[PDB]
Design a protein around this ligand. Structure first.
Ligand code: HEM
Length: 179
């Protein structure tokens, strides 16, 4: 099951989260139903409580990439949204529209000018498929801020227990994520 004690940090300036693009420097997957390791980057934007984000995954083992577009509504709680998502090709052509069974809930635990910490619960129907914490930065392999490192320790986690993506030979598609 996804981790239970997850609520958005109150007082967060949303302009810092919905900013630039994010690259995942570190991830923590509690119970990886696969052993393949991924890199990821995404570009979150918000307008009138609606979030839209182009999302990229790179499978570091197979060296393949897949693409999605998430769309969700901000909760009344703060920087937290449940997104449904399209599946697209690298040109953003829709392969599958969003549906009412598949979603993810993203919760911003910290965000500052250079870095973020977010939690993501991926669900399909009645099932939590996967729980992830991800440390984010605005450029590939940038060092996460002290503030975000402190947020990891505040979340009850050890940053050392995360998988660091730098060693994975990540490839990104910065054209896909632009816009
Ligand atoms: C390095 C960080 C991440 C890793 C390691 C990771 C890992 C994974 C894995 C293993 C899957 C299952 C893929 C499959 O076999 O079909 C997946 C799917 C998914 N992830 Fe991530 N992910 C990362 C970051 C993110 C982020 C930042 C988001 C959203 C902002 C996200 C949202 C999703 C969604 C929506 C799917 C389902 C795609 C589908 O069913 O086609 N992930 N991720």
């Amino acid at each position: 099951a996804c981790s239970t004690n997850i609520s958005p940090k109150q007082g967060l300036d949303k302009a810092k989260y919905f900013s630039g693009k994010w690259y995942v420097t570190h991830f923590l997957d509690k119970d990886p139903q696969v052993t393949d390791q991924y890199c990821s980057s995404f570009t979150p934007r918000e307008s009138d409580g609606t979030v839209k984000e182009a999302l990229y995954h790179y499978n570091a083992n197979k060296k393949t990439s897949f693409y999605n577009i998430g769309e969700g509504k901000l909760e009344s709680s703060g920087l937290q949204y449940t997104a449904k998502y399209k599946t697209v090709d690298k040109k953003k052509a829709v392969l599958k529209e969003a549906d009412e069974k598949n979603s993810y809930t993203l919760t911003v635990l910290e965000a500052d000018d250079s870095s973020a910490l977010v939690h993501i619960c991926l669900r399909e129907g009645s099932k939590d498929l996967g729980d992830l914490y991800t440390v984010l930065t605005h450029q590939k392999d940038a060092e996460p801020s002290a503030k975000v490192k402190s947020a990891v320790t505040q979340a009850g986690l050890q940053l050392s227990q995360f998988v660091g993506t730098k060693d994975l030979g990540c490839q990104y598609d910065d054209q896909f994520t632009s816009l």
